[PDB]
Enzyme design. Structure first.
Site, PDB file in Angstrom:
ATOM      1  CB  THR A   1      -6.730   2.983  -0.737  1.00  0.00           C
ATOM      2  OG1 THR A   1      -6.204   2.853  -2.060  1.00  0.00           O
ATOM      3  CG2 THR A   1      -7.180   4.410  -0.498  1.00  0.00           C
ATOM      4  CD  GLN A   2      -3.037   3.010   4.073  1.00  0.00           C
ATOM      5  OE1 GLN A   2      -2.973   3.891   3.216  1.00  0.00           O
ATOM      6  NE2 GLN A   2      -1.963   2.471   4.638  1.00  0.00           N
TER       7      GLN A   2
ATOM      8  CG  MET B   1      -3.291   0.257  -5.973  1.00  0.00           C
ATOM      9  SD  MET B   1      -3.014   2.016  -6.314  1.00  0.00           S
ATOM     10  CE  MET B   1      -4.660   2.670  -6.035  1.00  0.00           C
TER      11      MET B   1
END
Ligand SMILES: [Mg+2]
Ligand SMILES: [Mg+2]
Lengths: 204, 240, 231, 195, 219, 244, 233, 235, 222
Positions: G1-2, G107
């Protein structure tokens, strides 16, 4: 919730003239409920005395761990560990659990068998050493013990005078702490005799 | 890791390390198993080359795996301890998961399985051990006696012997053991087991160990004097 | 001699004896023929039985809808290499929506076989493969040796007495290459080719195994009464 | 929440354990036995998180039974309590800690003395004349603090326990559906027929 | 939720003639009735039955797996697996997964001559319990049997089947998420016997007319 | 590859013997003699240091007698370095047991552990075995005073009296002759020294060539004391028993 | 995730009778800051494919390198690398779609919406979409971000269904695209006046137009708008 | 010494060829496939009369539709049987159906060459895998430590194989009844066995579609032996 | 944060006849209030006379269908080109779905085909692989609009024989492929009117012993 104040209890150590004293209460509780009045918090490996306050499971575990390590030390070194060396071993052992620490306030007391010099040390739960000349305090009534010790303590007390001072410091501190008391033990440590005294105190 | 294939086939289709393991068994002190109608007896030779031995503490030749199953062996003593430990762990693991103690056949099949594994795993040699596994299945009164060997083969026996001079005591058992009428009592079964060892042992003194296993976890090791009474009675009947 | 104990050891003349011994396993194997035109590629394999009670060992393996091979030597080694081709063909389709080029399939088999010839503990593959396929550049026939050497050919044969079929194809080269849009005639040429490698035994209904792939023909294997037409 | 009480008298140890298994407002069992025999002269009662209690109790039983067979010896209650405490003490800083509270009642054949060990889920161990885990703890402690004598007989200890259970039945909001009582003495472990 | 969950109407009880297993056949996602024809009894093998309460997938997958593990046990030991052993394979499996979000409340029912008729309640919490009677009504498990707690040990197979059928009807009427049909099973030593699919719509009117019960409802 | 150079340290001979174990036992036969004698009221460990020098610091020297814990000591015969590896493992096992059960490890359990480690080196790993034989002198409250020996095979046995190292054949015959069951520690001390004095390959048995230890309940009341004898104390007991 | 940092706005595309057109503005925005103006977001792969990328620019530069490596890799041991075994649009898309769905499934997505425009070997138009979720779909018109809301409605008036594609010339298609880019400049706050346009035609091949500007803009009517309600001055 | 995976100059794996010698020393196992079922028979060959022969397990169930007879180092067969049972059950779990006999045999044969410097040596045991599936009906396979498996109308393995196989060559036809096959296995076992064939030193089994895999009672086999003796005395 | 899931809308319908099965889906693909495509096929021929649809998050749907198609290819390779029966396909898809039990495929899966007795079969799956054989199953956005209608017009629920006053249920009749397709078309026409995510086109795959055939019908594009 706070691991260092679930079970309660206190330890205090003081230096005198050619002697050291270490004392603890006997209470073990589950917060408000008192469970045992026979939970001694002072252990000894040869002539080196270790008091441990905080989470009772960790007190028992660290005692078993230092018995283990001082037994191996003695077999290899062919001599009993000294207070100065043990202090470093306690510090090392605590700091190796830096990010998952034992929830304890250890106190070392003893006389160096070679120099005859009285020694005390305290530690935070991750092994930072407090090497005070005068006195070390630990547990749920540490504020009360600091107060008592700072006024009652004078340097170079004779063993039987030091006994009265440390006893009055512990008793009156414990009586101002809900989670401390239910009896107390005092160790008067000289170079080649140790006397252990159980104090009479209020049981509430 | 050390991966060297020690157990391999020879041109004549033999695995020499497995066959040389059987030679280690041949050198081992004699062990004998005899099952009666309502019991199994494990007789074991104690070589009298070792005196000044402390018999209280010296590893006994018959080991309890569980309260109802015993294991005796011929061959390398050190090797036997590893099989005994694994068997004891498996016996508690079986009780924990199946909520029932192991059958004698199951415990045998496990030990034999371990022995086999050590004959085609890299970097290991076979066990220099053969085992006699005796006892009673839970809530069963039918006597059980099994034999395992380094190769990992196992089978059931009316009576069997392993170790040095096992050829001689098997000869005895093959003519003296009737299948239609097995030793009806503990006495008869112990007597036939002591008789079978007296063919090989030397002195009937501290050289013979006898362990009687009965149904419902009833296991007892006979003392020197109890065995000595069997030794006395056998030779007094022989003087005729 | 002293240099044949493992695949990691060169001989003083720079030979790899373990690889040469693997190459020997192929020569002991039953004959299989490969040949192609511009439209179709054909495999013909003589299957070998253990005895009269036994089945005839299958020689041809399908790798994809457009590609498959025939084996000569250790059948389990063919199963490992064909499984690897099935995966590489499958990877190309799933990731790139692309049918794996026969030439690239040859390069992959070469590199897989090579790793077994340069490392200790392992052994060379004991099988030879004839890969046929139809891709974006038309019909292809490959010959695989467990040395790692893969070769694109108009026709070839591997296994016992393969030299007879190979000489025939070398003569017929100009004829069978021109058999375009006639699958039956290309198979006939393959059946006539493998017939040059027979001695004592002849092609029976459970003896003969044929595979074909082409322009509008998925890779399909013919066994039993499906090859009676060609006997 | 559940009731596990232990009292150590002159010559035996008595464990009383609630028979009820409740998940939320659902009563799953009313005849549950919250006890495992670790060894012939050692009994462990357990209360805590569902599944973990039986899994922990049975794991300890297997390990103590394994030690019994290997050494052909019965571990002292002190040794068994030290082993059980250590296993609990491992769990607290583990990935998913066991939430199990236990009482260990054993008779020591070497010392001819009954022993009762109280160990909480953190591996906090004390040896007591009487002990309890849960809500019932504080009430029973005050009653036992008054009545308990160390020279009490097994029948006297049983009467005192019966008083505790009667008082607990009155004062507790939950129905714990009665207790099973087990005596640990020199002759072994027996379930009290009527209570 | 995305995953079909069943919190209601699975009943299993022990009696003279073996075990009766009774379930409803309704699947609900929130207030949406996904199906009226789901099987809440999993046939692990011809001698072992499992009831589906909790995650429908979690129950199906792991009780089908249990049948696989039971089959292996029988090949290896040449003996029928005990209900105690079969239940403990599943209970020990879900205990490994504890905290990961498995949802399962199942009654493992079998009749062996070693044990007799045996019911084990197995939980995603790792709970394994032996009991004479277990019921699940709107996400709540009970050991008492929906209607009169006493019922009868000495109960005819016909009567025991009816009690189980009538017990599901009681729950199906009152519980919003319970309904569709009743599926009946009789578990004997020689295996389980299916006692059919009964629509609760038709059952309710017939029971009311014959018993005289549900006076409050007009029909 | 590497296979060429492998001695294969864990294979049977055609006779069903473990080559490396047999050769290790040959090595140990050349090591200084160690003797253990078990009496009713304690145990004696006596061992001969191998051809020493006048410049060897004896009072700080240890090659034969080692402490495992307060209740258990070992006499070593073989490679001292190999022995120290095993001794340190045994010392840890004893403390592991004491931490777990809050009781001193029973003697046999420690012995079985060390013997199982030795066994492992003969069955897997392709390493040479430990060229060490131990005499274990120990006390626990189950079996009381116990003597054990273990050898590179990982086999161990219990003894009333036993010898390891050089001239064990001669030593064992002398022990078997003079040993009685009602024997006391002071008598066992004399037997041990008299046996070494007759079996030694040295001209005479002196204090500087001996290590000596006693495990006695000669500790004030219901406890056990280990005594590793000092050079002067060995010299005194040699005069007392009338050997010098 | 970013989270996306430097971002590109709409990519718009449509099919016409003989091929596909794709367009994107030359802006790399840093939140509300219009930080970089010389950003090329149409990346040609050979002479038959253009990949138009919106979203995170760091992830776009990564994808640009994957495609550059893909061309190198395809040429390895490939005598027909510039003929029958050249990269097809369909191959390049399926690869990107595989990578996108794998990255979301760990993810750790590539924070992009990608349109692959090209012409296949048989002359068939290729136009398919893939985004950070691995979601894929094909339509006679495709657009990302604001383009989906404002460009699609305009482009769908030219090609509303498959049967309109043969009736749509390259002049009408390009005109519709250029008009849609002007509308996006009017109504998109993260847009730019400077844009690139690529035509992939089955006859005339790949035509890549750089430094195009939105022109013929209507602003004059602004002078008459005064106040927000009552104000007359 | 030399690699375990080494090829001979004839292009054969030494260890595989040597394992085939170990199988030749094994007790005889015979399979006969018919349209009414597949029969599996073994010589038990007890090493002593005190050995309880019923404990000799050389015929083993893999699933209800697949039986298995072994010859050679029979201890090596246990992990092969374990894999076969797991493969059969696993496939049923994944696909809600019976696994094809060939697919089961192929799975067992995949273990065979997984040896080197994985297990230290090939298996020293051959398997006769007999079964039924809907696709290819009654089937008998011979699984070798080479990783090769042949389908057979009839096959003998172990010490008396080449003698037994020559006998099966003459006796087998496509119209054999299950009863005829049973007597035929008994007849050929009796011919190649050292000791005299009875119900205690030989064991029969069969796989039928209806009843699945069954190991014959000693009483049931004893009757077939008596039937054999009478029909051989009948001419 | 990053949400790995999305909703591409769509509605699918599986009906099992006596000797046939139909799997129908709308061809509209949406995110939020935007149309991605008016024709993005959702129902696929997987081979072996099996049709499949995984409705919900289209990415997970494409992944599952792709994996299942591959499973059929490898079943052929591993089991001598044996035809994969619909029941075996169903069990296989459960394992595919349950494999991602702790990071699920966000789809409602329906497969249609013939069983081994040649009778029509539909299997319905939850996202984590719970499955049931059914005669009627609608999945997706408009499932709640379609299933009540099918209960009434297929199973004749709450319908009784006129003049019996609810004592005789309307008897179940075997529906022809032509009548089932009318019910499918009317279901989607009704759903298109009342559900904003349903429209554009309807693709129906019909399965018989003769194989898989395809019928397409336009739906309202608003
Ligand atoms: Mg206080
Ligand atoms: Mg609509």
């Amino acid at each position: 919730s706070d691991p260092s104040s679930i079970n309660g209890g206190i330890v205090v150590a003081m230096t005198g003239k050619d002697c050291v004293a270490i004392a603890c209460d006997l209470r073990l509780g589950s917060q408000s409920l008192g469970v045992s009045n026979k939970f001694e918090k002072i252990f000894h490996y040869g002539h080196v005395f270790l008091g441990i306050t905080g989470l009772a499971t960790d007190v028992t575990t660290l005692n078993e761990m230092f018995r283990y390590k001082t037994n191996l030390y003695k077999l290899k070194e062919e001599r009993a560990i000294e207070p100065e060396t043990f202090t470093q071993l306690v510090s090392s052992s605590l700091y190796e659990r830096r990010f998952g620490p034992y929830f304890v306030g250890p106190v070392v007391a003893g006389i160096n068998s070679k120099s005859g010099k009285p020694f005390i040390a305290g530690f935070d739960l991750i092994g930072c050493i407090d090497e005070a000349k005068d006195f070390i305090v630990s547990g749920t009534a540490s504020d009360q013990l600091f107060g008592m010790c700072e006024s009652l303590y004078e340097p170079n007390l004779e063993p039987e005078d030091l006994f009265e001072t440390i006893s009055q410091a512990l008793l009156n501190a414990a009586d101002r702490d809900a989670l401390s008391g239910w009896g107390a033990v005092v160790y008067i440590i000289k170079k080649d005799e140790v006397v252990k005294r159980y104090l009479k105190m209020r049981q509430d | 890791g050390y991966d060297r294939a020690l157990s391999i086939f020879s041109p004549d289709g033999h695995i020499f390390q497995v066959e040389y393991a059987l030679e280690a068994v041949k050198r081992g002190t004699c062990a004998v198993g005899v099952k009666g109608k309502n019991c199994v007896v494990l007789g074991c030779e104690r070589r009298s080359t070792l005196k000044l031995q402390d018999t209280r503490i010296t590893p006994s030749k018959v080991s309890k795996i569980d309260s109802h199953v015993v294991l005796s062996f011929s061959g390398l003593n050190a090797d036997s301890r590893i099989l005994i430990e694994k068997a004891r762990v498996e016996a508690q693991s079986h009780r924990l998961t199946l909520e029932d103690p192991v059958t004698v056949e199951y415990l045998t099949r496990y030990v034999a399985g371990v022995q086999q594994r050590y004959t085609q795993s890299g970097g290991v040699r076979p066990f220099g051990v053969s085992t006699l596994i005796a006892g009673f299945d839970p809530r069963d009164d039918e006597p059980k006696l099994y034999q395992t060997e380094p190769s990992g083969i196992y089978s059931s026996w009316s009576a069997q012997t392993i170790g040095r001079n096992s050829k001689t005591v098997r000869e005895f058992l093959e003519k003296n053991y009737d299948r239609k009428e097995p030793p009806a009592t503990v006495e008869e079964c112990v007597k036939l087991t002591v008789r079978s060892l007296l063919e090989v042992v030397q002195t009937g003194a501290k050289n013979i160990e006898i362990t009687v296993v009965k149904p419902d976890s009833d296991i007892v090791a006979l003392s020197s004097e109890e065995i000595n009474q069997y030794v006395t009675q056998i030779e007094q009947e022989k003087q005729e | 001699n002293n240099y044949d104990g493992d695949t990691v050891t060169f001989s003083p003349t720079g030979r790899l004896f373990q690889v040469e011994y693997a190459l020997e396993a192929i020569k002991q194997g039953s004959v299989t023929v490969g040949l192609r035109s511009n439209t179709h590629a054909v495999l013909v394999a003589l299957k070998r039985n253990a005895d009269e009670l036994s089945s005839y060992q299958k020689k041809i393996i399908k790798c994809d809808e457009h590609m498959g091979l025939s084996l000569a030597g250790l059948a389990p080694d063919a199963r490992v290499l064909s499984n690897y081709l099935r995966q590489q063909c499958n990877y190309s389709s799933l990731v790139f929506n692309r049918k794996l080029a026969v030439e690239r399939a040859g390069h992959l088999l070469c590199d897989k076989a090579q790793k077994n010839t340069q490392s200790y503990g392992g052994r060379p593959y004991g099988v030879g493969l004839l890969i046929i396929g139809y891709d974006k550049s038309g019909a292809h026939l490959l010959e695989f040796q467990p040395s790692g050497n893969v070769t694109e050919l108009y026709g070839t044969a591997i296994g016992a007495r393969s030299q007879g079929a190979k000489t025939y194809l070398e003569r017929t080269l100009d004829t069978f290459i021109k058999i375009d849009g006639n699958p039956d005639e290309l198979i006939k040429a393959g059946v006539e080719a493998i017939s040059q490698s027979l001695r004592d035994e002849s092609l029976t209904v459970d003896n003969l195994s044929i595979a074909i792939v082409g322009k509008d023909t998925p890779f399909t294997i013919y066994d039993g009464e499906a090859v009676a037409k060609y006997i | 929440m559940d009731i596990i009480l232990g009292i150590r008298v002159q010559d035996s140890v008595i464990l009383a354990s609630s028979k009820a298994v409740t998940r939320g407002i659902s009563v799953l069992k009313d005849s549950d036995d919250k006890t495992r025999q670790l060894s012939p002269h050692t009994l462990m009662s357990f209360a805590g998180e569902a599944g973990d209690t039986v899994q922990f109790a049975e794991y300890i039983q297997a390990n103590i039974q394994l030690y019994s067979i290997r050494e052909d010896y019965e571990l002292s209650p002190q040794a068994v309590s030290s082993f059980v405490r250590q296993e609990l003490a491992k769990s607290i800083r583990s990935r998913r800690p066991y939430q199990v509270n236990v009482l260990i009642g054993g008779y020591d054949k070497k010392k001819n003395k009954p022993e009762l060990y109280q160990i909480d889920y953190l591996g906090t161990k004390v040896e007591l004349p009487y002990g309890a885990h849960g809500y019932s703890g504080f009430y029973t402690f005050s009653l036992l603090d008054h009545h308990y004598r160390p020279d009490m007989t097994t029948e006297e200890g049983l009467d005192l326990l019966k008083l505790c259970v009667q008082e607990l039945e009155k004062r507790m909001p939950m129905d714990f559906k009665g207790v099973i009582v087990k005596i640990v003495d020199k002759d072994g472990i027996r379930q009290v027929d009527d209570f | 939720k995305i995953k079909i969950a069943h919190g209601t109407t699975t009943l299993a009880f022990r009696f003279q003639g073996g075990i009766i297993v009774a379930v409803d056949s309704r699947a609900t996602a929130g207030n949406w009735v996904a199906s009226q024809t789901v099987k809440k009894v999993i046939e692990i093998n011809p001698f072992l039955l499992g009831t589906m309460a909790g995650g429908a997938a979690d129950c199906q997958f792991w009780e089908t797996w249990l049948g696989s593990q039971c089959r292996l046990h029988e090949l290896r030991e040449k003996e029928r697996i005990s209900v105690a052993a079969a239940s403990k394979i599943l209970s020990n499996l879900v205990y490994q997964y504890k905290g990961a979000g498995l949802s399962m409340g199942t009654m493992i029912c079998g009749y062996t001559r070693k044990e007799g008729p045996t019911i084990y309640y197995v939980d995603s919490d790792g709970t394994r319990l032996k009991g004479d009677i277990f019921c699940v009504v709107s996400g709540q498990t009970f050991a008492y049997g929906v209607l009169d707690s006493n019922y009868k040990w000495d109960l005819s197979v016909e009567d025991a089947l009816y009690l189980g059928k009538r017990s599901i009807l009681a729950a199906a009427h009152r519980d919003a998420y319970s309904g569709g049909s009743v599926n009946l099973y009789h578990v004997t030593e020689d295996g389980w016997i299916y006692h059919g699919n009964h629509d609760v719509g038709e059952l309710f009117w017939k029971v009311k007319e014959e018993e005289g019960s549900f006076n409050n409802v007009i029909g | 590859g590497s296979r060429r150079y492998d001695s294969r340290t864990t294979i049977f001979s055609p006779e069903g013997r473990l080559y490396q174990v047999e050769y290790a036992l040959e090595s140990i036969s050349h090591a200084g003699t160690a003797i253990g004698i078990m009496a009713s009221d304690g145990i004696v460990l006596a061992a001969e240091r191998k051809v020493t020098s006048t410049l060897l610091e004896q009072d700080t020297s240890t090659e034969k007698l080692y402490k495992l814990n307060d209740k258990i000591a070992v006499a070593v015969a073989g490679l001292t370095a190999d022995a120290e590896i095993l001794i340190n493992t045994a010392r840890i096992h004893a403390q592991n047991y004491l931490k777990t059960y809050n009781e001193d490890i029973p003697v046999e359990i420690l012995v079985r552990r060390l013997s199982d480690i030795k066994q492992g080196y003969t069955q897997h790993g392709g390493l040479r075995p430990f060229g060490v034989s131990f005499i274990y002198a120990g006390y626990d409250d189950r079996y009381g005073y116990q003597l054990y020996t273990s050898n590179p095979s990982g086999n161990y046995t219990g003894w009333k009296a036993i010898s390891v190292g050089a001239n064990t054949s001669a030593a064992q015959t002398l022990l078997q002759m003079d040993y009685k069951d009602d024997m006391k520690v002071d008598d066992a001390i004399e037997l041990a020294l008299k046996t070494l004095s007759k079996t030694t390959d040295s001209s005479a048995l002196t204090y500087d060539r001996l290590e000596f230890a006693t495990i006695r309940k000669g500790a004030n009341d219901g406890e056990v004391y280990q005594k590793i004898f000092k050079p002067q104390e060995i010299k005194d007991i040699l005069v007392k028993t009338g050997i010098t | 995730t970013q989270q996306p940092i430097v971002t590109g706005t709409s990519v718009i595309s449509m099919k016409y009778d003989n091929g596909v057109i794709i367009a994107a503005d030359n802006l790399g925005s840093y939140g509300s800051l219009l930080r970089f103006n010389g950003v090329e977001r149409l990346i040609p792969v050979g002479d038959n494919t253009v990949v138009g990328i919106s979203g995170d620019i760091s992830d776009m530069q990564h994808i640009e390198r994957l495609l550059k490596d893909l061309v190198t890799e395809n040429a390895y041991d490939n005598p027909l690398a510039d003929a029958e075994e050249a990269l097809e649009p369909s191959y390049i898309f399926e690869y990107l779609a595989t990578v996108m769905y794998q990255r979301r499934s760990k993810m750790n997505p590539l924070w992009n919406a990608i349109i692959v425009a090209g012409v296949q070997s048989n002359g068939d138009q290729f136009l398919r979409y893939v985004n950070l979720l691995g979601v894929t779909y094909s339509s006679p018109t495709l657009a990302t971000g604001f383009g989906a809301h404002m460009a699609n409605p305009l482009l769908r008036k030219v090609v509303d269904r498959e049967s309109d594609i043969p009736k749509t010339t390259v002049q009408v298609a390009e005109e519709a695209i250029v008009n849609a880019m002007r509308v996006l400049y009017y109504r998109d706050a993260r847009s730019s006046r400077n844009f690139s346009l690529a035509i992939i035609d089955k006859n005339t091949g790949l035509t890549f137009k750089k430094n195009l500007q939105v022109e013929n803009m209507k602003w004059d009517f602004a002078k008459d708008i005064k106040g927000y309600g009552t104000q007359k001055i | 010494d030399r690699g375990v995976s080494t090829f001979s100059p004839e292009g054969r794996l030494f260890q595989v060829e040597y394992s085939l010698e170990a199988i030749k020393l094994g007790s005889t196992a015979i399979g006969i496939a018919t349209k009414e079922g597949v029969v599996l028979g073994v010589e038990k060959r007890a090493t002593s009369p005190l050995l309880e022969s019923d404990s000799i397990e050389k015929i083993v169930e893999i699933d209800r539709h697949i039986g298995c007879a072994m010859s050679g180092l029979t201890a090596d067969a246990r992990s092969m049987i374990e894999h076969a049972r797991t493969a059969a059950v696993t496939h049923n779990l994944y696909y809600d159906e019976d696994i094809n006999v060939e697919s089961l045999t192929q799975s067992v044969c995949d273990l065979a060459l997984r040896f080197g410097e994985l297990m230290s040596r090939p298996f020293g045991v051959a398997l006769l895998i007999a079964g039924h599936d809907a696709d290819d009906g009654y089937q008998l396979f011979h699984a070798e430590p080479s990783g090769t498996f042949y389908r057979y109308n009839a096959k003998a393995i172990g010490s008396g194989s080449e003698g037994a196989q020559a006998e099966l060559l003459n006796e087998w036809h496509s119209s054999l009844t299950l009863k005829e096959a049973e007597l035929l296995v008994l007849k050929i076992l009796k011919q190649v066995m050292e000791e005299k064939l009875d119900e205690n030193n030989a064991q029969l089994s069969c796989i039928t579609k209806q009843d699945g895999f069954k190991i014959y009672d000693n009483e049931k086999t004893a009757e077939l032996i008596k039937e054999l003796k009478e029909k051989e005395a009948a001419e | 944060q990053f949400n790995p899931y999305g909703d591409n809308g769509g509605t699918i319908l599986g009906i099992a006849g006596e000797d046939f099965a139909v799997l129908a889906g709308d061809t509209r693909n949406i995110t939020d209030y935007s149309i991605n495509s008016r024709y993005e096929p959702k129902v696929f021929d997987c081979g072996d006379n099996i049709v499949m649809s995984a409705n919900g998050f289209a990415a997970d749907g494409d992944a599952l269908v792709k994996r299942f198609k591959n499973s059929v290819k490898w079943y052929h390779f591993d089991h001598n080109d044996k035809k994969l029966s619909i029941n075996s396909a169903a069990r296989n898809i459960q394992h595919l779905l349950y494999g991602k039990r702790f990071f699920p495929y966000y789809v409602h899966t329906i497969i249609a085909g013939l069983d081994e007795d040649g009778k029509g079969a539909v299997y319905s799956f939850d996202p984590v692989g719970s499955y049931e054989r059914e005669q009627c199953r609608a999945g997706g956005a408009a499932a709640s609009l379609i299933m009540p209608f099918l209960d009434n017009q297929v199973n004749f629920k709450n319908q009784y024989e006129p003049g019996t006053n609810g004592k005789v249920k309307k008897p179940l009749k075997y529906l022809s492929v032509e009548e089932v397709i009318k019910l499918v078309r009317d279901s989607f026409t009704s759903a298109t009117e009342r559900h904003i995510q349903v429209g554009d086109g309807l693709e129906i795959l019909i399965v018989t012993k003769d194989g898989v055939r395809k019928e397409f019908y336009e739906l309202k594009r608003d």
